[PDB]
């Protein structure tokens, strides 16, 4: 049991036990959640559907959602075991290496900038309009958003975007799904040192930085996340929706925190 | 049981069982927090051990925010039965009358404005203050604010800026009092017909449009905060400090929904 | 002297003279800017050209934003007559005018996201990347938003997350051109019945419902715009950078009128 | 004929040529406004009338914006000269000092909460009230504010949730007095050692960390401050009423530089 009890949530993005959707489908599944899993190509269906396992589910799913088909394909599937289901954690964002390592304006290109908001924002929405008829009134959809899309940090470039598309495309979905009984809602989570760290300079300068001036004086952790995600897709959150909820230790109400 | 479980927290602002402090109280309860509570006035000294003792709860004690003294005696008093605990709940807000009437320029005055923001915005620290010894690593504290603080909302007028305050000192009260392991939010609730409502010009229609344009299509009722509260105040909110988290069905993300 | 005397500033998307860059273009000149236009395709030429004349310019040039050439093609042009110049307009905005009707999930595609993406919010860092060595010390770069970047407004539908990634541009250019001398701003203007509004529906009762309730009690023009513009394009505003001004009367701050 | 040429503006909070007022009065008469000074107390009126004459001012008035009959009194002696006028600029903020030292739940009383409300929010809306009737159509009000209304900053303590209450003031007056003609803004502006910086502990620092990250790669100036206030008390700025306008560089929009 737990306060997910009778839900089904599909969960994407778990790519390595450091994911933050490994921790929010670790949260669900002991607040009783029934899961199933996407995973984005064959290196990582070996990996996730023993995770899934673990977790209770034998509802492992190739998407891609670079592509309208591997989309409806996934979909489709899931109907054959979850006719109708209770909503999906967003837990995708990417953009091409060489667009997060300099001087934004040098580093950023058309190319970059298309699939850093393809891959980190349409593909949401993408995911709702494909599974919308599957959705029982009460539903919840969750995304994964960072403190780039509000404020110019170094090196994030185009990502800083593509996060406040996502962030948008959170409060448009939420108000055309919400009258017939969805919410939708993104958590904005402090730096977390997951696969999303590879070749990211100075992420440990970083994260200390962050420990040393968020209130709570600690960065945050994929079971943080995971507990405010939990939260978030379960009916205790019947009046939230359209909302980023900040989920990094307070980190950005405070200012000149690092001057001692 | 519950996710609140070795939880002690004090619930301030029970006035009636419409009120928003009651909804957070019953929620608290359900996930097996102990609690306390206080009061006003002796007008409301039989109402609230009533509904405390409903609530597993024999500590009722006297609080008028306005007062110092009365602060600390109840603090004093508490401590003999909490010595430590784990929290609050600030469910007080306060302007008088005549400031929620007309034409904000007009209907202001530094008497009213002076009421407005020491029981609405100063309290609340004046009550961390006086407990501070007392809170537990883990501890989190609680205010309820509303849109008003953001947007010029008519007739709500001198309490706009009183919530403004109070959503200020929420951060400044996260950003001190988080080192030492005290998470500080607020819930900035949609409109709720409770005793904040006697006597407010045209509340029904304002209830009537925010059903119309929400996205959930519906107002937000005390059960709908209280569960929001129920979880900011828990463990399950390590990661959230310091944020106003909108418990209005997502009113306050959408423009222009009136014109149908 | 107006204060953008000694400026030169390129001025995009005069359309006709309801466009929110004519009236931004006439402010700028009012100033005593020297002024430079482009035009996006052939359709739109002649009418540029004349705007152009009219306000004493013979910089009249083409630039398509979905192509990269086009940009760079415009500023080697311009480079021939203004080697460096001080800042530029940016005023473009375009989705397929099949995503800006109905319910915004059923609506959007991922093609007509593309599109609104590319055209109004990575075209002002394309052109600022092709033109940032002719850029002086002092200059100043400028968008237009709406406020369907910050709330969900009933069929913008995806231009409201091509104008939030706009707005994030404008921050992420800001710092990254901040160092070298340049500002980059945006304003967020109310709404304004321009060529944009063709075809939308109930345009006309979201100007009435806009007139009602912004505090200055009438819709803003592409006068008021134009005079927010000149000044965030000038060095009176040398102190702000990566903001969006709101030029929409108060409308965004209001909430709860009409019941 | 500058952009306030023809415009009366009261300019209260001159207290030293370091004073931000000091710079946005400069501006205005530079704009051709027609200017008129308040002093808190008997203290500081020989310099303000010293200031005022060199900006061709005679007209300098008491006002201690604690106590509503002083407001009063200023108004009916400035209705003698300026029976009607077109705005007034709002540049008082004060705490007890010892508010802003050290941990902010140790630092704030209710003295002290209740005294840096009342002087630097609530005044802004008592002097609208005292000389409303007395405000033209097209008038601007405006005040200043700081980011530790918006964030929460180490020993800025209760001057920020202040600062936040007197935000929420300039809406709601933007809100009741534009139907009448009147915009109310507030600039945000970044760190200056005015005499506000008197006492406070790493002022110093605080500076160059800010001159590190924000955009433009230095502070602001109350002449980059003034040129702003100018703007938006002028008819230049029609379109905005309610608004927050930073005016720190870019400081604000910025995170995660050094580390
Ligand atoms: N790690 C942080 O500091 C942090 C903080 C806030 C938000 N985020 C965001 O959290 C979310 C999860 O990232 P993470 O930190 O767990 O790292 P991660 O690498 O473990 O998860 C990212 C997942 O995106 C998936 N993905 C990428 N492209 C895809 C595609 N075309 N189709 C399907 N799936 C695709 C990947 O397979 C991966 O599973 C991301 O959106 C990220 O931007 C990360
Ligand atoms: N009702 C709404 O629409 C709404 C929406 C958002 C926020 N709020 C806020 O929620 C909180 C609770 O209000 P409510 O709606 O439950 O109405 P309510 O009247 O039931 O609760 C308000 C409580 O404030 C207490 N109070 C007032 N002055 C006090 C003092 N000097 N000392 C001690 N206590 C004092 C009162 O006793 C009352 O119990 C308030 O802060 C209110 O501003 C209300
Ligand atoms: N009218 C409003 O209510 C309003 C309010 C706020 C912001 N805006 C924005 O202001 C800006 C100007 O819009 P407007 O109202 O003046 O309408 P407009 O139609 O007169 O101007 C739009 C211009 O964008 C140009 N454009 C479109 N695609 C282009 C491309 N690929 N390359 C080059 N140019 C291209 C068009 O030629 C046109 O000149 C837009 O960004 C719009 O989103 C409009
Ligand atoms: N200096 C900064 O870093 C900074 C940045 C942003 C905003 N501000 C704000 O700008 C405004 C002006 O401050 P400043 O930096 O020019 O310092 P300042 O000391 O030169 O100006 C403050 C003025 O407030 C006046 N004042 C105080 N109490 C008063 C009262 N009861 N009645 C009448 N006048 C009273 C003072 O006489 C003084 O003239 C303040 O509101 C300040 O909070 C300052
Ligand atoms: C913090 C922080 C993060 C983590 N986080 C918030 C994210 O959203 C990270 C998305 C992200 C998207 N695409 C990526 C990668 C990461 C890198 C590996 C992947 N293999 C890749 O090729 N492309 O990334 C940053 C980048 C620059 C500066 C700061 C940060
Ligand atoms: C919504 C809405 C609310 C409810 N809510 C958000 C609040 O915070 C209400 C605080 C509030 C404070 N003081 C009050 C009262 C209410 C009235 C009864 C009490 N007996 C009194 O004397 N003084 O109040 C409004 C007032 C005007 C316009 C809209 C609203
Ligand atoms: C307000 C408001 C506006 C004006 N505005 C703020 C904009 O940014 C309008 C951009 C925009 C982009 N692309 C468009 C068009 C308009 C339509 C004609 C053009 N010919 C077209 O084909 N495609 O448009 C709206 C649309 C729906 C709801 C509200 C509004
Ligand atoms: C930045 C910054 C400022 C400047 N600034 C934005 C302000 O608004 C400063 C208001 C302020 C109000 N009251 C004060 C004083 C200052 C001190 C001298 C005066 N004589 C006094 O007695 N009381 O002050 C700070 C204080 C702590 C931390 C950071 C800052």
Same mark, same amino acid.
């Given at each position: ?137 009460? *539903? &919840?959809?969750?995304?994964? @958003?960072? #403190?780039? =899309? ?7 470039? !185009?990502? %800083? ?66 507990? *405010? &995600?939990?939260?978030?897709? @379960?009916? #205790?959150? =019947? ?7 900040? !989920?990094? %230790? ?11």
């Amino acid at each position: 049991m737990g306060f997910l009890s009778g839900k089904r949530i599909l969960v994407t993005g778990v790519a390595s036990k450091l994911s933050i959707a490994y921790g929010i489908a670790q949260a669900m599944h002991r607040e009783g959640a029934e899961l199933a899993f996407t995973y984005q190509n064959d290196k990582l269906k070996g990996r996730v559907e023993e995770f899934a396992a673990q977790l209770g589910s034998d509802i492992v799913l190739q998407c891609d959602v670079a592509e309208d088909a591997s989309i409806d394909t996934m979909f489709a599937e899931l109907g054959k075991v979850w006719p109708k289901f209770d909503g999906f954690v967003h837990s995708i964002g990417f953009a091409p290496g060489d667009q997060l390592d300099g001087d934004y304006v040098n580093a950023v290109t058309r190319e970059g900038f298309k699939i850093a908001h393809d891959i980190s924002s349409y593909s949401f929405v993408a995911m709702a309009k494909a599974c919308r008829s599957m959705l029982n009134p009460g *539903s &919840a959809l969750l995304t994964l @958003s960072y #403190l780039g =899309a509000e404020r110019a940090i170094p090196n994030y470039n !185009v990502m %800083g975007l593509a996060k406040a598309s996502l962030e948008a495309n959170v409060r448009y979905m939420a108000n055309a799904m919400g009258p017939e009984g969805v919410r939708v809602n993104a958590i904005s989570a402090g730096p977390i040192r997951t696969l999303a760290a590879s070749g990211i300079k100075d992420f440990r300068k970083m994260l200390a930085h962050c420990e040393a001036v968020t209130p709570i004086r600690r960065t945050v952790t994929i079971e943080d996340v995971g507990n *405010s &995600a939990a939260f978030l897709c @379960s009916d #205790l959150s =019947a009046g939230i929706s359209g909302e980023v909820v900040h !989920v990094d %230790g307070g980190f950005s109400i405070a200012a000149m925190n690092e001057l001692e």
